Structure 1
Amino acid sequence: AKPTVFVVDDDMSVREGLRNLLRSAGFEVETFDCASTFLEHRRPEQHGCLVLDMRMPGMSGIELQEQLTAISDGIPIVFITAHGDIPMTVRAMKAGAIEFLPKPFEEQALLDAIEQGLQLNAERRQARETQDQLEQLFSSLTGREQQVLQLTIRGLMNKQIAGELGIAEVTVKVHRHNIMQKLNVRSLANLVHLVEKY
Structure 2
Amino acid sequence: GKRVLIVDDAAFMRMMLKDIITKAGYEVAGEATNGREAVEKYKELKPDIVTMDITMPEMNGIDAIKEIMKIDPNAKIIVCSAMGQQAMVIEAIKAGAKDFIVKPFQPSRVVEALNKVS
2: CA distance, partners of 1:84 / 1:26: 30
- Displacement, 1:96? 2.8
2: CA distance, partners of 1:116 / 1:81: 18
Which secondary structure does the structure 1 equivalent of 2:67 belong to?
A: helix
Higher strand share: 2
Paired position in structure 1 for 2:57: 57
Q: 2:35 matched to 1:35?
A: yes
- Displacement, 1:69? 2.0
Which secondary structure does the structure 1 equivalent of 2:87 belong to?
A: coil
Paired position in structure 1 for 2:20: 21
TM-score by length of 2: 0.83
2: CA distance, partners of 1:60 / 1:83: 17
- Displacement, 1:17? 1.5
Question: Looking at both structures, which has the greater relative contact order when contacts are Cα pairs under 8 Å and sequence separation is at least 6?
Answer: 2
2: CA distance, partners of 1:16 / 1:68: 23
Q: Deviations over 1:137-181 (max 9, x none)?
A: xxxxxxxxxxxxxxxxxxxxxxxxxxxxxxxxxxxxxxxxxxxxx
- Could you tell me whether the CA contact under 8 Å between 1:6 and 1:49 is conserved in 2? yes
Residues 56-95 of structure 1 mapped to structure 2, 5 A cutoff: 56-84=56-84, 87-88=87-88, 92-95=92-95
1: CA distance, partners of 2:68 / 2:53: 15
Q: Which runs of 5+ in 2 are unaligned?
A: none
- Displacement, 1:91? 5.3
Q: Which runs of 5+ in 1 are unaligned?
A: 120-198
- Could you tell me whether the CA contact under 8 Å between 1:44 and 1:73 is conserved in 2? no
Higher helix share: 1
Which secondary structure does the structure 1 equivalent of 2:58 belong to?
A: coil
Q: Percent identity?
A: 27
Paired position in structure 1 for 2:6: 7
- Displacement, 1:85? 5.3
- Displacement, 1:86? 5.0
- Displacement, 1:89? 6.2
Paired position in structure 2 for 1:133: none
- Displacement, 1:105? 2.8
TM-score by length of 1: 0.52
Q: State the Cα RMSD in Å.
A: 2.3
Aligned length: 117
2: CA distance, partners of 1:93 / 1:41: 21
